[PDB]
Amino acid sequence: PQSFTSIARIGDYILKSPVLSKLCVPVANQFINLAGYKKLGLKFDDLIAEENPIMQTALRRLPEDESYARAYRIIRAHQTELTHHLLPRNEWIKAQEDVPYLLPYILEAEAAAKEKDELDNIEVSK
Amino acid sequence: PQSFTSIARIGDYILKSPVLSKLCVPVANQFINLAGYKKLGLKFDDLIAEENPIMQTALRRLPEDESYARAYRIIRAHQTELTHHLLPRNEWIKAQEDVPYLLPYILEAEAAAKEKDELDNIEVSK
Amino acid sequence: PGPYPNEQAARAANQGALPPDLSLIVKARHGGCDYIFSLLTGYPDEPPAGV
Amino acid sequence: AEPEHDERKRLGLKTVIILSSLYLLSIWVKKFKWAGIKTRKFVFNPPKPRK
Amino acid sequence: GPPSGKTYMGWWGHMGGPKQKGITSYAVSPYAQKPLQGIFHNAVFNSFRRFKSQFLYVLIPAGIYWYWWKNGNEYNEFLYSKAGREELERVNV
Amino acid sequence: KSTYRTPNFDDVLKENNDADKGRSYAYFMVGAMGLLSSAGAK
Amino acid sequence: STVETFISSMTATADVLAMAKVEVNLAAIPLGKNVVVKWQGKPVFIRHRTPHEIQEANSVDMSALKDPQTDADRVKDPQWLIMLGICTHLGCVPIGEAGDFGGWFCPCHGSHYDISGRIRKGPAPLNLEIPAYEFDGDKVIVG
Amino acid sequence: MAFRKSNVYLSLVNSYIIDSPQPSSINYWWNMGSLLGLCLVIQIVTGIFMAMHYSSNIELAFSSVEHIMRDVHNGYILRYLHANGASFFFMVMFMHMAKGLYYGSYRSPRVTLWNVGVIIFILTIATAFLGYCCVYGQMSHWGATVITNLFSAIPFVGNDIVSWLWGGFSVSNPTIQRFFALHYLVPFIIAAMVIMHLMALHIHGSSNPLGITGNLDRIPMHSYFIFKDLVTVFLFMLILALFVFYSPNTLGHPDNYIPGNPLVTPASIVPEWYLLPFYAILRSIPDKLLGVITMFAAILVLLVLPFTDRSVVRGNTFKVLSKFFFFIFVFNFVLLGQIGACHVEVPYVLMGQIATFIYFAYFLIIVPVISTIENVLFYIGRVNK
Amino acid sequence: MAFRKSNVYLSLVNSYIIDSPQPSSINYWWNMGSLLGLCLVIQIVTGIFMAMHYSSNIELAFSSVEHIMRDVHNGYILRYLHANGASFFFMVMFMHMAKGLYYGSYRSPRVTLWNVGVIIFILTIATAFLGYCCVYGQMSHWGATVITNLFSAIPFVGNDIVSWLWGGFSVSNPTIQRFFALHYLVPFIIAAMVIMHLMALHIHGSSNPLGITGNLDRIPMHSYFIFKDLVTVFLFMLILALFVFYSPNTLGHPDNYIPGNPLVTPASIVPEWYLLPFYAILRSIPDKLLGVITMFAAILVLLVLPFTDRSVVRGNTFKVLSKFFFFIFVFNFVLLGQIGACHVEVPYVLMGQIATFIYFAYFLIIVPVISTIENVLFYIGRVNK
Numbered sequence A, B: 001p002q003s004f005t006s007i008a009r010i011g012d013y014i015l016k017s018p019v020l021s022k023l024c025v026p027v028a029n030q031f032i033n034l035a036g037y038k039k040l041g042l043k044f045d046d047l048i049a050e051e052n053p054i055m056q057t058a059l060r061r062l063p064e065d066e067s068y069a070r071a072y073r074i075i076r077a078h079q080t081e082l083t084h085h086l087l088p089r090n091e092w093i094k095a096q097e098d099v100p101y102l103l104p105y106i107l108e109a110e111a112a113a114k115e116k117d118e119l120d121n122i123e124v125s126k
Numbered sequence C: 001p002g003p004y005p006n007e008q009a010a011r012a013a014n015q016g017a018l019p020p021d022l023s024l025i026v027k028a029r030h031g032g033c034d035y036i037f038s039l040l041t042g043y044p045d046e047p048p049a050g051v
Numbered sequence D: 001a002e003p004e005h006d007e008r009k010r011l012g013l014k015t016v017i018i019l020s021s022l023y024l025l026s027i028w029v030k031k032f033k034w035a036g037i038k039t040r041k042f043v044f045n046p047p048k049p050r051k
Numbered sequence E: 001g002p003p004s005g006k007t008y009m010g011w012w013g014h015m016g017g018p019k020q021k022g023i024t025s026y027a028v029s030p031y032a033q034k035p036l037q038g039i040f041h042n043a044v045f046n047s048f049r050r051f052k053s054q055f056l057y058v059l060i061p062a063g064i065y066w067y068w069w070k071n072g073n074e075y076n077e078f079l080y081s082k083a084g085r086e087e088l089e090r091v092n093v
Numbered sequence F: 001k002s003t004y005r006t007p008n009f010d011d012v013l014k015e016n017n018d019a020d021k022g023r024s025y026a027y028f029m030v031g032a033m034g035l036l037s038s039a040g041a042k
Numbered sequence G: 001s002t003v004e005t006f007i008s009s010m011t012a013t014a015d016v017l018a019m020a021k022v023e024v025n026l027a028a029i030p031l032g033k034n035v036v037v038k039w040q041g042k043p044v045f046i047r048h049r050t051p052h053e054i055q056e057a058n059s060v061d062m063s064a065l066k067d068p069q070t071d072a073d074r075v076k077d078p079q080w081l082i083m084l085g086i087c088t089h090l091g092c093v094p095i096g097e098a099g100d101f102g103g104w105f106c107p108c109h110g111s112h113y114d115i116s117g118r119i120r121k122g123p124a125p126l127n128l129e130i131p132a133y134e135f136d137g138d139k140v141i142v143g
Numbered sequence H, I: 001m002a003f004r005k006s007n008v009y010l011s012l013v014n015s016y017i018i019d020s021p022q023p024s025s026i027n028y029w030w031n032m033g034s035l036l037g038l039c040l041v042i043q044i045v046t047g048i049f050m051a052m053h054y055s056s057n058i059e060l061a062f063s064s065v066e067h068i069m070r071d072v073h074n075g076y077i078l079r080y081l082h083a084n085g086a087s088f089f090f091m092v093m094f095m096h097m098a099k100g101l102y103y104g105s106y107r108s109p110r111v112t113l114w115n116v117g118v119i120i121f122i123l124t125i126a127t128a129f130l131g132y133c134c135v136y137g138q139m140s141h142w143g144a145t146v147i148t149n150l151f152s153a154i155p156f157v158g159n160d161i162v163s164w165l166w167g168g169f170s171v172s173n174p175t176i177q178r179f180f181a182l183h184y185l186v187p188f189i190i191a192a193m194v195i196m197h198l199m200a201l202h203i204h205g206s207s208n209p210l211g212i213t214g215n216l217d218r219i220p221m222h223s224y225f226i227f228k229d230l231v232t233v234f235l236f237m238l239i240l241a242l243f244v245f246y247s248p249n250t251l252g253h254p255d256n257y258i259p260g261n262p263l264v265t266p267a268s269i270v271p272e273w274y275l276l277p278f279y280a281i282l283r284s285i286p287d288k289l290l291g292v293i294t295m296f297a298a299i300l301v302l303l304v305l306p307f308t309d310r311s312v313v314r315g316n317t318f319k320v321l322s323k324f325f326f327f328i329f330v331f332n333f334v335l336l337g338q339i340g341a342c343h344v345e346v347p348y349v350l351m352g353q354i355a356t357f358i359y360f361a362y363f364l365i366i367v368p369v370i371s372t373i374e375n376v377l378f379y380i381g382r383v384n385k
């Protein structure tokens, strides 16, 4: 259970610096494509947990096409893992295919939750 | 469990037999008014069990006025018995006010269910 | 303790049965406290006539 | 047969005293918090004749 | 959670009893009452009335069976007393 | 009579105080009851 | 197989499967007294029957007994009464020297037995069991 | 969904203890059943303490019982509580059955509950006998041998089954050890089946003394019935204290207090007070196997008791002949117990047989016919046209 | 609605056993839990059958198992199955905990399950240690003394509780009687909390190896997962039978088959294999109460894991290096146990502190930094601006 906004802040701090980005972006890409989830054909915006209320508020606002594709990918992943195999080298997702689609909903919903939490317990403002 | 049609048959057998009915009707009404449910402000139909499905079917056809009066009588009986008391001779059901308002529905439902279950399991013998 | 080693010397000398353990005879019989008193008091020195 | 009669009777006296007190206490409290339910009255007004 | 079996009584809001209207209750707090307002009147008059009401169904079987037991006891006592050598032989045949 | 005409309850009503009189008595007795129950359990 | 193995583990073991043997001397038993000896989980009667009691034992009408059993079958020595202390009636040994028949008095019941131990009245349609024993001279081995 | 009802662990207690819609016409007879359950669990816990401080070997069984009697602090109290708790347990079981039978609670809504209770009784009388066996006195093992000889009456086989059950032709360590173990174990089956009994009860609800529907009004059990249970158990505990402290060894019989010696039986041998009517029903019928099966029929007749009562009106409060005959029945039961207490001679056997006959005739005949007469009288008297 | 779902007992059986929407990606690891439950049940059954012919006397305890071996039919089977089943229960329990840890089963919807499981773990630490103390062998008395004197360091109360445990001022008959009583009873508490565990799980459901929602495809428990449970339990029964019948002296230690006599004893005294991980850690920090408090810490670290890591992606299957550090930890656990098996000496004594430090450090400092690093690496990899 870790907030997404802190991760976004760290990413914004590290990417804009030229030397850090040019030294740590390719290593990040090779870590992420050696992770194993791209191998099975799953977009990265599906592996995270779906039990905290932030996720429930997030994908409740997700468009129909994204939800349908997510359901198809989830059931295909379940069947493939049950089958003890991998998909052929034609129906995977490339680097450009793994576009982040679940980010803005998380950002907005978690910002709303944070302002709720930090405004409910406000002080008298001495 | 005992069919009401048999009760009606025995009742009509008794009621039109002069000597036996003349012997058995005064003891009958004396037993009725020594039973004690008259004092508690109960009509007889409120006492017979209302659990098995045929009784529920009979209840569901009662006009709303009778059901409301029955509910009030049950509630008042519960309250009166909770205090082990008895209200004086003002709520007492009069001698001729204990008329069966629920017998015809019971008889009709008995006949219908009996002939239904008889003709359901039937043979084509001559 | 008791004079008998465990039980042997009892049945040999009683000229008959065994002596019941008195540790529980108070509740071993019906009646109770007065039962033993009556049993040890009411017996005459001579049996009833004809017995 | 029973080397606890004095202690048994003392403990029993204490127990019967405490249980008698508790029983009377429960009587009072049961008659107290059931007072609001043993006195409620019902009034039946027949409804207007329209289903 | 699948629904349970069909039963006449259930939970609050769905007793299953007939729908009723026109019933009015009138409660009042136990704090604004005397908790033992009528204990003596109850325990004397109502207790005696209930005892009188139940005094027509309980004592008769007890009395008849008491008579049966006592008659059996008298028969047993009389049999083994100055009759055991002439009467007890003609009953055990 | 309508619902507004409340039936009489004078038979069990008490002195018109309706204050800490009954409340303190009941609370003190239940406190004593807890005392005795705790002592017995201990 | 598992249930059978568990049951056989629960059932009687080796040491209980060994029967005990005891010898009782008949010289010291009084004529008018009853001696009861325990054998292998259950008691065994040892009574010195009087000569009059032998006649009563052997002169019992068969029609009054649900199970026909004579005196000579249940014991070899008419004078000595040696019977196991069991009561097929219920299982509790009748009280000695009591009863309407002059024999035994079953305590759980109040029913009266004869001097020969046969069943007279009750829900017992079966006579008491008969054990087996042998003589050895001045003593009898109940086993 | 507050915290009390949202949390599953607290929700289970909420549906049972915190909130349960019992009717408002409950007499002082159902808290008697709750008292039955509570004295049962008290018996279980004191049994656990005993098993903690008890030895079952023949060389030490009587030694263990007298050591827990004498050579331990608060020891004799445990034995006295066991005896009085067993006696009160059977008394309250009889009261529970009488309340169930008189108020017509065996009818269609809770027939399953009725059979569950019946089988509870069938096996708890067994476990009571088994606990009676564990004493190993001059009459406990004596009655145990009695019951083994009784069970030996199975047709077509007489020796193999009795030898397997009784651990050979003799009695040794395995027999008494297994008997103690099974008296320890069966009450756990009692607890499980009582859990089933409460589940069925909660599913089907509770009946009323009025013998009418109770859905019209209901009240929560907590804060209304918990204190009624508290006061009735305080009364029960006061009575139990009176019988455990002032006169502890009165309900039991003065026969168990003899060291292990199955040589000479005591003059007075009688079963415990909660078994006399069944000893009478055995003694009346003049047959061994038929006597056993008629005892079992007397025990199991409650199973065939439903769908035999064709009285349209539930309960027995408003019917006079039925309750008169019910009182005749209960007094016949107590008379059967009393006659079984004494010995078997003329003329007790004749009236005992008559008592058993009227018992079985009652169950199998009289309630149907008198209930039919009650229903036809109900119909004829009201209708005068 | 079918009658199978109508009857309350049958409805509960169907909804809790026959019908259960389990996930479709279940491996043998999840059937391992049901296998462990069956092992627990068979352990209780065989223990009950063992105690029926058992004597609780101090001098008749070792003699009791000797009599079981040499006199009763198939006596060796019960005790061998008991011991090997206990050892296998503990090994499969470690496997179950590890499977729960690696697959991220400790997330928010299962914190209650984690708590009840760790409570079962806490009690299971001693429920078999005291059972081993019961046998009174040649290190059993030593284990009993260790467990009874670990608590003596509490300030202002050091003698009263140990005196209560001792049943006096030393080790005597009360000690062994209490040991046997509690070793018998507290597995029933295990049964209670495992019923609670299964209730919570059935309320919330199982998890997936992938770490994503499993509410898409499900199959009923009966005829689909019953076969998997059946084959797993068949394999377990096969291996357990082969060990118990062919190699009895493999799981247990040949130290307890000697009567208790503190006169002559070898120096090869070491607790059973499953104690070693929580035994080597106790010998690192050199104080008396420090050992107890660090046992408390080592059993609470399993509890602090929820809301400690910062892995938004459930599980470790799809993380590049976190599984590597988990493997480092499991091998450190094994090596810590093995080095605790060896006696204290240089450098093993020096190895103790560093092993304990790594064992705690993975729990405390490794998981949050590694989770945050993994999350930021995912975020930088996925996006380009």
Ligand SMILES: CCCCCCCCCCCCCCCCCC(=O)O[C@@H](COC(=O)CCCCCCCCCCCCCCC)COP(=O)(O)OC[C@H](O)CO
Residues within 6 Å of the ligand: B082, B083, B084, D027, D031, D038, E039, E042, E043, H028, H235
């Ligand atoms: C010579 C004996 C002395 C005994 C002294 C100790 C006991 C004192 C009891 C209280 C003082 C006596 C007051 C007069 C009798 C009161 C009886 C009665 O009915 O009063 C209440 C009784 O209070 C109870 O709740 C009693 C519970 C009875 C439990 C089951 C019966 C057991 C036997 C009870 C009497 C004996 C008690 C002691 C036995 C050793 C009202 O009943 P209730 O509270 O259930 O309300 C019902 C309704 O409103 C009627 O008004």
Ligand code: HEM
Residues within 6 Å of the ligand: C013, C014, C016, C017, C018, C019, C020, C025, C029, C036
């Ligand atoms: C010194 C005084 C004695 C006292 C107070 C005493 C007390 C008792 C008591 C209470 C009983 C059992 C009574 C009952 O049935 O409850 C008994 C029985 C018996 N006593 Fe004594 N006794 C005494 C002397 C003796 C003596 C001297 C002997 C011979 C050595 C003896 C031998 C027996 C025997 C054999 C029995 C059992 C009788 C039987 O089994 O039929 N007693 N005694």
Ligand code: HEM
Residues within 6 Å of the ligand: H040, H043, H044, H046, H047, H048, H050, H051, H054, H065, H079, H082, H083, H085, H086, H089, H128, H131, H132, H134, H135, H183, H184, H187, H252, H256
């Ligand atoms: C509701 C259930 C039970 C009933 C009705 C019951 C009944 C009895 C009875 C009548 C006795 C005879 C004791 C006496 O006459 O003094 C007895 C003895 C005994 N019971 Fe139970 N029992 C029950 C449960 C248990 C349990 C759970 C145990 C657990 C170990 C147990 C252990 C014992 C022991 C050890 C004895 C012998 C001790 C003695 O003789 O003082 N009982 N029981």
Ligand code: HEM
Residues within 6 Å of the ligand: H029, H030, H031, H032, H033, H034, H036, H037, H040, H093, H096, H097, H100, H105, H106, H110, H113, H114, H116, H117, H118, H120, H121, H194, H197, H201, H205, H206, H207, H208
């Ligand atoms: C022996 C252990 C038993 C326990 C703990 C127990 C418990 C209960 C409880 C809690 C109730 C709800 C009403 C009340 O509290 O009394 C009840 C009701 C009932 N029980 Fe039992 N019971 C037991 C045995 C039996 C037996 C043996 C029968 C067999 C005749 C039986 C038949 C009934 C019936 C007919 C009811 C219906 C009462 C109502 O209308 O709710 N019970 N029982």
Ligand code: HEM
Residues within 6 Å of the ligand: I040, I043, I044, I047, I048, I049, I050, I051, I054, I061, I065, I082, I083, I086, I089, I127, I128, I131, I132, I134, I135, I183, I184, I187, I252, I256, I272
């Ligand atoms: C399920 C939890 C249990 C575990 C882990 C367990 C463990 C053990 C172990 C390890 C031993 C032998 C010590 C050794 O060889 O290392 C043992 C012995 C024994 N256990 Fe358990 N046991 C459990 C439950 C039970 C239960 C429920 C009983 C019920 C009667 C029982 C009765 C016995 C008996 C009679 C022995 C013989 C030796 C002794 O007295 O300790 N055990 N147990």
Ligand code: HEM
Residues within 6 Å of the ligand: I030, I031, I033, I034, I036, I037, I040, I093, I096, I097, I100, I103, I105, I106, I110, I113, I114, I115, I116, I117, I118, I119, I120, I121, I194, I197, I198, I201, I205, I206, I207, I208
């Ligand atoms: C040793 C006694 C235990 C028993 C009998 C037991 C029983 C079970 C059972 C039957 C399951 C269902 C498995 C499945 O979903 O297919 C399960 C799952 C689980 N148990 Fe236990 N358990 C025990 C101990 C523990 C412990 C100590 C923990 C850790 C604190 C734990 C945590 C879990 C978790 C997290 C799951 C869910 C697994 C999953 O969904 O992937 N259990 N347990």
Ligand SMILES: COc1c(O)c(C)c(C/C=C(\C)CC/C=C(\C)CC/C=C(/C)CC/C=C(\C)CC/C=C(\C)CCC=C(C)C)c(O)c1OC
Residues within 6 Å of the ligand: H016, H017, H020, H022, H030, H031, H034, H037, H038, H041, H044, H045, H191, H198, H201, H202, H206, H221, H225, H229
């Ligand atoms: C009909 O309306 C109801 C109703 O609906 C309900 C639910 C109840 C409630 C029901 C009951 C109270 C009866 C239920 C009976 C039980 C639950 C029996 C419990 C059985 C047990 C064996 C208890 C289990 C407890 C343990 C195993 C723990 C005991 C062990 C201990 C204390 C170990 C001690 C050792 C040490 C070292 C401390 C009613 O009473 C009631 O009537 C008003």
Ligand SMILES: COc1c(O)c(C)c(C/C=C(\C)CC/C=C(\C)CC/C=C(\C)CC/C=C(\C)CC/C=C(/C)CCC=C(C)C)c(O)c1OC
Residues within 6 Å of the ligand: I016, I017, I018, I020, I033, I034, I037, I038, I041, I044, I048, I191, I198, I201, I202, I221
């Ligand atoms: C949620 O999905 C499930 C799921 O539904 C189930 C059922 C299981 C399986 C769970 C189990 C098998 C655990 C259940 C175990 C118990 C409830 C233990 C309860 C058993 C006992 C307490 C003991 C059993 C008692 C007996 C067998 C009584 C008989 C014993 C004796 C000694 C009497 C016999 C003696 C004679 C002389 C006849 C799962 O693992 C699971 O997750 C996948």
Ligand code: FES
Residues within 6 Å of the ligand: G087, G088, G089, G090, G091, G092, G094, G106, G107, G108, G109, G110, G111, G112, G122
């Ligand atoms: S037991 Fe034999 S006559 Fe009664």
